[PDB]
């Protein structure tokens, strides 16, 4: 209880709510799901001044993502869609459309905000560990075992982010990851130590 509360306190210094009208209850639900992430990662995101921006409109309607209008995201080739249609972005920043958390809401992640925040942890906190030799070996064996083989199975950083989301979303996804991807699960367990 106290650890979840500490994580919510840390997130209060990371999450940026949109100006204007937005679904406050769903924004709170997204923060609560993010609070399941191990506090060491959250504290490191705060120290690096990473902001998790929750949005009520399209990502590319924000001034800082306007440059992505018409750009085809990695792994979205052939879909006829561009960044204008993507609900969640992670990496050097994090930007997330409120209401689009669940799989199928314009994206394929088990949870939008955990997946995007995993990219920021990978890139900012862990210095692109998903592209390290160690993780590439794990990805070579287990990277297709969550499905979405043309996305998760092709880009190790995507398999990392999705695995991270399974690890932290809830007890069921955590158990599913352990059964499907035992080496990835052990990798994530050891990373948090």
């Amino acid at each position: 209880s106290t650890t979840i509360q500490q994580n919510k306190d840390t997130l209060s210094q990371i999450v940026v709510f949109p100006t204007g009208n937005y679904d406050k209850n769903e924004a709170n639900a997204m923060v609560n799901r993010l609070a399941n992430i191990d506090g060491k990662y959250l504290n490191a995101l705060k120290q690096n001044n990473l902001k998790i921006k929750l949005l009520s409109g399209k990502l590319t309607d924000e001034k800082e993502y306007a440059y992505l209008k018409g750009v085809v995201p990695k792994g979205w080739e052939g879909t006829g869609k561009t960044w204008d249609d993507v609900p969640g972005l992670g990496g050097s920043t994090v930007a997330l459309r409120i209401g689009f958390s669940n799989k199928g809401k314009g994206h394929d992640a088990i949870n939008l905000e955990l997946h995007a925040t995993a990219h920021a942890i990978d890139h900012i906190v862990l210095n692109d560990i998903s592209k390290s030799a160690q993780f590439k070996q794990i990805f070579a064996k287990e990277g297709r075992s969550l499905g979405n083989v043309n996305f998760l199975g092709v880009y190790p950083e995507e398999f990392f982010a999705e695995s991270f989301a399974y690890y932290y979303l809830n007890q069921d996804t955590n158990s599913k990851l352990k059964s499907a991807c035992p080496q990835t699960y052990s990798f994530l367990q050891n990373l948090a130590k």
């Binding site: 992505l68 995201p73 990695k74 792994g75 979205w76 960044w83 993507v86 969640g88 972005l89 992670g90 990496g91 050097s92 920043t93 994206h107 995007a116 990219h119 890139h123 950083e157 995507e158 982010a161």
Partner: peptide, 4 residues
């Protein structure tokens, strides 16, 4: 960096 950006990722979907």
């Amino acid at each position: 960096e950006v990722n979907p």
